[PDB]
Short mmCIF file of C-alpha atoms (C1' of nucleotides) in Angstrom, two decimals:
data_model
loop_
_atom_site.label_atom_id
_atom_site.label_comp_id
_atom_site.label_asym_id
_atom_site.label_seq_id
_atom_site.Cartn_x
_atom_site.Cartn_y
_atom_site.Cartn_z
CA UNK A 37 75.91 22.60 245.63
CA UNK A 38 73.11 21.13 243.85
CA UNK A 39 71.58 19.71 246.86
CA UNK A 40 71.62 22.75 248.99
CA UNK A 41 67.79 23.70 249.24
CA UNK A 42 66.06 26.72 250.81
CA UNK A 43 66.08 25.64 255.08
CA UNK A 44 68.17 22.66 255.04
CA UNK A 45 70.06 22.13 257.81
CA UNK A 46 72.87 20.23 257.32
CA UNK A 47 74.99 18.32 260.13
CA UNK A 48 78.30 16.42 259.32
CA UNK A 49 80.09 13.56 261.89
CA UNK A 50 82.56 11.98 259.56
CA UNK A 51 84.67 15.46 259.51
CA UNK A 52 84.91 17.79 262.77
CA UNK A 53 81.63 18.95 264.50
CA UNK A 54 79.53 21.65 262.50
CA UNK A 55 76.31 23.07 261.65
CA UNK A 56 75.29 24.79 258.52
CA UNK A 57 72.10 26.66 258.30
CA UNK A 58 71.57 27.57 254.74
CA UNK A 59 75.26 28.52 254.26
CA UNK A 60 76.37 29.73 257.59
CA UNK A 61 77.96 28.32 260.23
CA UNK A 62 76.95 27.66 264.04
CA UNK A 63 78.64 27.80 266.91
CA UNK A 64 78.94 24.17 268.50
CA UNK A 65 80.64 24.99 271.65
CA UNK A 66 82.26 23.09 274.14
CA UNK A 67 84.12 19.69 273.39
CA UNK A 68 81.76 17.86 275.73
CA UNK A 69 79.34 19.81 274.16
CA UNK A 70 80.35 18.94 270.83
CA UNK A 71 80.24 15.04 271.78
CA UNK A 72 76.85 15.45 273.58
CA UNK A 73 75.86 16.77 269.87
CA UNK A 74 77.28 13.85 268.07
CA UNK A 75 76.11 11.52 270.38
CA UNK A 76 72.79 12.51 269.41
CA UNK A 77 73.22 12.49 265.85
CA UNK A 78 74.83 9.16 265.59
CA UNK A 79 71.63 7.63 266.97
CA UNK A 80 69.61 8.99 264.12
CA UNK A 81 67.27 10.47 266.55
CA UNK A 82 66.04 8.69 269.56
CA UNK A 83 64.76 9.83 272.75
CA UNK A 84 67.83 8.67 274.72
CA UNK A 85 67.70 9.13 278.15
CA UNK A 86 69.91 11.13 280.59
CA UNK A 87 71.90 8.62 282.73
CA UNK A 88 72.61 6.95 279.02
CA UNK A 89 73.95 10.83 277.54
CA UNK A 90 75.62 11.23 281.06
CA UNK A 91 77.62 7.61 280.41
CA UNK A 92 78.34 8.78 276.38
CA UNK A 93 79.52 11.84 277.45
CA UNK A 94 82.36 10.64 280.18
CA UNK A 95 81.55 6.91 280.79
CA UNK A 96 82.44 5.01 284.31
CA UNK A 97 82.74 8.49 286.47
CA UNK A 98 80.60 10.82 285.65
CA UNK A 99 80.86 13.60 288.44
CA UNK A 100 77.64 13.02 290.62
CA UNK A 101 75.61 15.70 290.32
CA UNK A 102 75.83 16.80 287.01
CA UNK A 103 73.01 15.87 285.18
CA UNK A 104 71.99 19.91 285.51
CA UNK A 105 75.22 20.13 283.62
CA UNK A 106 73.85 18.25 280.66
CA UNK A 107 70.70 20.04 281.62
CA UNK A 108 72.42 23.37 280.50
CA UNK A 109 74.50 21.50 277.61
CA UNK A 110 70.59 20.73 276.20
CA UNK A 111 69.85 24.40 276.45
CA UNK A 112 72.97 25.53 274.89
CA UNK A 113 71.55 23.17 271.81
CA UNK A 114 68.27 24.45 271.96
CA UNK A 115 69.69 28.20 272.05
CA UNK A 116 72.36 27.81 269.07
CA UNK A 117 69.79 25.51 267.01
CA UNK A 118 66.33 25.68 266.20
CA UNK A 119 63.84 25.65 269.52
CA UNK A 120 61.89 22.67 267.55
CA UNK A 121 64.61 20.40 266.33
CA UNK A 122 65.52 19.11 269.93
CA UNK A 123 62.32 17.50 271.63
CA UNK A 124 62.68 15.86 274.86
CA UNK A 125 60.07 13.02 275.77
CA UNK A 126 60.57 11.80 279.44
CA UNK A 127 63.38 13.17 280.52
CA UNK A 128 65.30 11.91 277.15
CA UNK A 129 66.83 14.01 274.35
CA UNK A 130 66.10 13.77 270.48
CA UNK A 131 66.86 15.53 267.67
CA UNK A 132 64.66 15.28 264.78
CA UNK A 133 63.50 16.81 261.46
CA UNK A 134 66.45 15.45 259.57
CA UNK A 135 65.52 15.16 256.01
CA UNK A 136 67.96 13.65 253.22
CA UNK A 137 71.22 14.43 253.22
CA UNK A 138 71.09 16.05 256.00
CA UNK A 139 73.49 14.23 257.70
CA UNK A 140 76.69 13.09 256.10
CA UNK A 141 76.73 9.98 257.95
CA UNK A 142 73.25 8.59 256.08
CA UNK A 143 74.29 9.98 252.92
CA UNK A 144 77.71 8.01 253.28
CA UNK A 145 75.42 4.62 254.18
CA UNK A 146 73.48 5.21 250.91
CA UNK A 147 76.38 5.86 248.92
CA UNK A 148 77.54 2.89 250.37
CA UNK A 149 74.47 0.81 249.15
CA UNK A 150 73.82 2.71 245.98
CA UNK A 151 77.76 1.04 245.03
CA UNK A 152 77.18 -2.19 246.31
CA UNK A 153 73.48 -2.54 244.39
CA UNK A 154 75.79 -0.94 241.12
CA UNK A 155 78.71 -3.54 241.71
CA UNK A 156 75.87 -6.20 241.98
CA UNK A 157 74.15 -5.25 238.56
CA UNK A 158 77.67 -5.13 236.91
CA UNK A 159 78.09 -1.07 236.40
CA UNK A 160 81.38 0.25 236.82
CA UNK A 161 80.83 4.07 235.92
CA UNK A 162 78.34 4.78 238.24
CA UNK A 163 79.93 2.77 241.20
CA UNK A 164 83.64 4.63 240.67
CA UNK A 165 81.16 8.20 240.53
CA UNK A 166 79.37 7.11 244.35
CA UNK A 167 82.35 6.16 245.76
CA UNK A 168 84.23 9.44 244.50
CA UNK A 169 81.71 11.58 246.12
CA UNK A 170 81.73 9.09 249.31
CA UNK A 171 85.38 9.72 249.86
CA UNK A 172 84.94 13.64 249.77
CA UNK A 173 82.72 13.33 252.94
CA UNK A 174 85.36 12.75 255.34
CA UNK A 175 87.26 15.46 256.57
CA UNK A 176 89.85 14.85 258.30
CA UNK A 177 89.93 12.23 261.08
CA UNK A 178 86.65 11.56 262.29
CA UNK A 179 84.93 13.31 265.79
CA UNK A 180 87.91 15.86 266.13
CA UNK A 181 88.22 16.24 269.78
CA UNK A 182 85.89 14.73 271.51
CA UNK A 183 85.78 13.04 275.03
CA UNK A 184 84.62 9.79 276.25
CA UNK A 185 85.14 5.82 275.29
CA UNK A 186 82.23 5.82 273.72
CA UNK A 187 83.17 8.60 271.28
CA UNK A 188 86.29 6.22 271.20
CA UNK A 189 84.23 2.92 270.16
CA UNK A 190 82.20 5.03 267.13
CA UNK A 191 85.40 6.11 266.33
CA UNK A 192 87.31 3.15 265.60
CA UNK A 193 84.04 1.75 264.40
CA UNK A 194 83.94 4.49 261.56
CA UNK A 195 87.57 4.21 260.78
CA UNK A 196 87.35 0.82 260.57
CA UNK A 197 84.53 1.41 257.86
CA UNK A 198 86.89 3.55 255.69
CA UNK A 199 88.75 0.95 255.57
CA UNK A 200 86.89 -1.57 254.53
CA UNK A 201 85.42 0.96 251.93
CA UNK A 202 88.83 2.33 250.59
CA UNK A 203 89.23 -1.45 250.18
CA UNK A 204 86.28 -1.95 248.00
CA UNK A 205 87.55 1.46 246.01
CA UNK A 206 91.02 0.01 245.36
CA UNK A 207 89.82 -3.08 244.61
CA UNK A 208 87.08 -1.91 241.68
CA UNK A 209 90.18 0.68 240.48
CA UNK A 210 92.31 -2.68 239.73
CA UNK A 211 89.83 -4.32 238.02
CA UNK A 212 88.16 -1.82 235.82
CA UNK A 213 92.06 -0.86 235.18
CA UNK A 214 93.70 1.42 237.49
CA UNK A 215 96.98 1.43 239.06
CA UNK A 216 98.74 4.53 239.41
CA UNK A 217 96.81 6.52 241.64
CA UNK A 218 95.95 2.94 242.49
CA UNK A 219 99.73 2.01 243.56
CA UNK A 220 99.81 6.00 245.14
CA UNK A 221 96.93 5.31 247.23
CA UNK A 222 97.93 2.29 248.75
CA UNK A 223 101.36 3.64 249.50
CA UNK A 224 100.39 6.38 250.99
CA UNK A 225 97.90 4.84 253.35
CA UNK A 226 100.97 1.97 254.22
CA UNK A 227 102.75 4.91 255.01
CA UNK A 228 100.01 5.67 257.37
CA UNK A 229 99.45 2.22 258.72
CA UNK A 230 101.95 -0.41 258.62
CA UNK A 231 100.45 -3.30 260.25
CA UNK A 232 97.53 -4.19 257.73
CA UNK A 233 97.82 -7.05 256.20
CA UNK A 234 94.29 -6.49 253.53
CA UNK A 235 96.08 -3.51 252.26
CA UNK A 236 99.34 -4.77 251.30
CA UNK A 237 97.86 -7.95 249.68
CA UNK A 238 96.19 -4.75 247.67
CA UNK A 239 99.73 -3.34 247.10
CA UNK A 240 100.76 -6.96 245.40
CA UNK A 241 97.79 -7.38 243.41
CA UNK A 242 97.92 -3.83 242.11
CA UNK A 243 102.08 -3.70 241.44
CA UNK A 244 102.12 -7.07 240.28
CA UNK A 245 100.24 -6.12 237.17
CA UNK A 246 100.96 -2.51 236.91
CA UNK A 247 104.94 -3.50 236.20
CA UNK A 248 106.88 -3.49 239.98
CA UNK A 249 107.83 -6.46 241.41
CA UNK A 250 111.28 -6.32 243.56
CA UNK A 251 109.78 -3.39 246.19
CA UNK A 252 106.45 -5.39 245.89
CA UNK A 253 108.16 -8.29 248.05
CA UNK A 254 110.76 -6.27 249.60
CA UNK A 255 107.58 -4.26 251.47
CA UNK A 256 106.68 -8.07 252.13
CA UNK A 257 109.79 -8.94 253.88
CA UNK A 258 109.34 -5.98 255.76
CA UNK A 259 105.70 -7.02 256.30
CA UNK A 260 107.12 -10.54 257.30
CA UNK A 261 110.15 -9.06 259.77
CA UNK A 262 107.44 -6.53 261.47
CA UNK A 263 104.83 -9.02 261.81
CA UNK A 264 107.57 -11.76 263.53
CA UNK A 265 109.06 -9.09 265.72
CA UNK A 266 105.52 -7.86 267.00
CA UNK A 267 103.10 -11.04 266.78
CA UNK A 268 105.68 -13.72 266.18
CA UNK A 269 102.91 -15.69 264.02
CA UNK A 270 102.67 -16.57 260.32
CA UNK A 271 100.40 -14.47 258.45
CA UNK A 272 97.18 -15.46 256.44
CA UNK A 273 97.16 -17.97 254.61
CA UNK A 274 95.32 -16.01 251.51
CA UNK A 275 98.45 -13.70 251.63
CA UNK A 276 101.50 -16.72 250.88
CA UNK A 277 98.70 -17.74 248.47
CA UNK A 278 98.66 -14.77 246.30
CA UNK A 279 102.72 -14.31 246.89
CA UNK A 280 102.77 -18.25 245.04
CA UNK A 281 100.73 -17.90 242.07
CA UNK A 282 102.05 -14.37 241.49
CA UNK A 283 105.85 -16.25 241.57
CA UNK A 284 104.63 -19.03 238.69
CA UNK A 285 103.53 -15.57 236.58
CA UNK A 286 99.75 -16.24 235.75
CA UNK A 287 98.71 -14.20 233.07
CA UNK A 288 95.54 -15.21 233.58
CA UNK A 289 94.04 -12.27 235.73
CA UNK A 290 95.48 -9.88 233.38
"C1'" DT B 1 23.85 -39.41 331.05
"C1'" DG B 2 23.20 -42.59 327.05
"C1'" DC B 3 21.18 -42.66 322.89
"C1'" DG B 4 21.01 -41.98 317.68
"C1'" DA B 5 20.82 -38.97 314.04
"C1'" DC B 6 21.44 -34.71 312.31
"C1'" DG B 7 24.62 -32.02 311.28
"C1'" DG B 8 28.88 -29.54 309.70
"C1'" DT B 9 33.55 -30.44 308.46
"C1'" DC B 10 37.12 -32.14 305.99
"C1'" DT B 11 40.33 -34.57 303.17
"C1'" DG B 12 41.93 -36.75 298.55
"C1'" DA B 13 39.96 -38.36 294.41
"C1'" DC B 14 47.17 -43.17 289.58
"C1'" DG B 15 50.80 -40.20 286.04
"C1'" DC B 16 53.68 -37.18 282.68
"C1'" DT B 17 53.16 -34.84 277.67
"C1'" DC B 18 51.91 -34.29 271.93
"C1'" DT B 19 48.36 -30.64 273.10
"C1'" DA B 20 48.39 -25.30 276.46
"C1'" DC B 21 44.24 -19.54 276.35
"C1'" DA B 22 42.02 -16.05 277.20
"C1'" DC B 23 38.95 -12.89 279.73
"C1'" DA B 24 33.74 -7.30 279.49
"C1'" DG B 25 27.30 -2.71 282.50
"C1'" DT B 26 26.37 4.02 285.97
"C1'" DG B 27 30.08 12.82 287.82
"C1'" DC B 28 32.91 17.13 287.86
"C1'" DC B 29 36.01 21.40 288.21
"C1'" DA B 30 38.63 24.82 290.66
"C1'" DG B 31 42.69 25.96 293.87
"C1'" DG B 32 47.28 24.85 295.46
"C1'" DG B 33 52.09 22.59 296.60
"C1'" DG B 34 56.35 19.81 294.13
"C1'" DG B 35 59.58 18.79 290.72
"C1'" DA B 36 60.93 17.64 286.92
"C1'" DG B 37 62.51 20.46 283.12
"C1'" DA B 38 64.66 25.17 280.48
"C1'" DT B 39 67.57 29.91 281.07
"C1'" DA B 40 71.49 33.03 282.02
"C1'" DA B 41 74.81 33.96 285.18
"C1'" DA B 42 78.81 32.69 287.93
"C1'" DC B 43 83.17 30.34 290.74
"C1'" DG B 44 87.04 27.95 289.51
"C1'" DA B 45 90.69 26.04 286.90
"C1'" DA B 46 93.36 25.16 282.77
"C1'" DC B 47 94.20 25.95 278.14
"C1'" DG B 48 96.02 29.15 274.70
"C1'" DC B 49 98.88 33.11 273.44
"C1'" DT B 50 102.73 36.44 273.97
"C1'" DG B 51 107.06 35.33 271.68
"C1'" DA B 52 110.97 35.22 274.87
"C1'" DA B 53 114.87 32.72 276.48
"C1'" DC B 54 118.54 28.73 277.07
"C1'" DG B 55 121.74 26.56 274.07
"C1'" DC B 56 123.31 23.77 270.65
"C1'" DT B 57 125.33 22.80 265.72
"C1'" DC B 58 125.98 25.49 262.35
"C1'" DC B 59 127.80 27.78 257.43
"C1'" DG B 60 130.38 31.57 257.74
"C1'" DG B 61 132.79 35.98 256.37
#
DNA sequence: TGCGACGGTCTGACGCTCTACACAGTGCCAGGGGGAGATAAACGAACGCTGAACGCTCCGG
């Protein structure tokens, strides 16, 4: 709220598609239409040309003659947004005049690097405040009904980033010294995904010191039969690692 | 025709690489046909919405 200036245009990826011009909302349109629009904003504004929007939008079979369909997607952009903020330089598209935090997806890379530059200088207060207001930009899953395998591949790109960043969240909460919505958390997202083995080495570090220790390798049994039944491998070695010195009892991470 | 000499013609002129690089002085505008590119409509299909309807276990007086 403190942020919202007079003309800012904001546009968000990491939720659903949306546009809000100084508080009110615009309408996006079609689901093609929608993924033509976050196909553009994901490339932080380059003149991309047609043939490569045509292969974003769909990706081996296009139907053949309609590039005057994403012809008339452009001019359903230029009508529901400003007549300026989509340029088009030799036949490509480009959205510009994107100031800061204008999209969520720039302000989640420098939240991102304002926490890594705090967890390098030692803070801890600071960090835990970025990441807190990174984890309220997602909204729900990420490019809500969109077409096309390249939608697909950003996707799973982004997700994969949340996960690596929920990672770094849980991690800092164990070692500045907290495990309860620490030990929530990572339940809840095993709930949601079963077959990773990062966050369930995260479950053993954070119940082995937080006072839980029988479901803590009972969930790795059941890691153990899941992971023979599907894969039929042995798991990392970092993992039986951290199951062996938490058996002796250190108390020397404590 | 035989002679020389006069002449044009033509060819290469051992071998790689450590090295190795690029290149310059004098017109002008209007009219007109294409095609890319924006606009709003439009033909067609399916995607939602209406709860309704088929049918089971159900706690039940």
């Amino acid at each position: 709220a403190e942020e919202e200036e007079s003309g800012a245009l904001r546009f968000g990826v990491l939720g659903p598609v949306r546009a809000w011009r100084d508080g009110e909302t615009l309408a996006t349109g079609s689901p093609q239409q929608r993924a033509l629009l976050a196909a553009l904003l994901l490339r932080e504004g380059r003149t991309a040309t047609a043939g490569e929007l045509i292969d974003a939008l769909w990706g081996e079979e296009p139907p053949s003659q309609a590039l005057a369909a994403v012809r008339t997607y452009a001019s359903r952009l230029r009508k529901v947004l400003d007549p300026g903020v989509l340029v088009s330089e030799s036949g490509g598209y480009a959205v510009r005049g994107l100031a800061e935090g204008a999209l969520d997806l720039a302000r989640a890379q420098d939240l991102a690097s304002a926490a890594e530059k705090a967890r390098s200088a030692g803070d801890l207060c600071h960090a835990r405040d970025l990441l807190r207001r990174a984890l309220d930009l997602w909204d729900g899953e990420v490019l809500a009904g969109v077409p096309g395998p390249y939608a697909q591949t950003q996707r799973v790109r982004l997700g994969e980033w949340r996960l690596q960043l929920l990672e770094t969240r849980l991690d800092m909460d164990l070692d500045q010294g907290c495990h309860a919505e620490a030990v929530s958390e990572l339940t809840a997202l095993t709930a949601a995904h079963p077959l990773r083995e990062r966050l369930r080495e995260l479950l053993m570090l954070a119940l082995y010191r937080s006072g839980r220790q029988a479901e803590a390798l009972a969930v790795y049994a059941d890691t153990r039969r899941l992971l023979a039944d599907e894969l039929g491998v042995d798991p990392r070695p970092g993992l039986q690692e951290l199951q062996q010195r938490i058996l002796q009892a250190d108390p020397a991470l404590a």
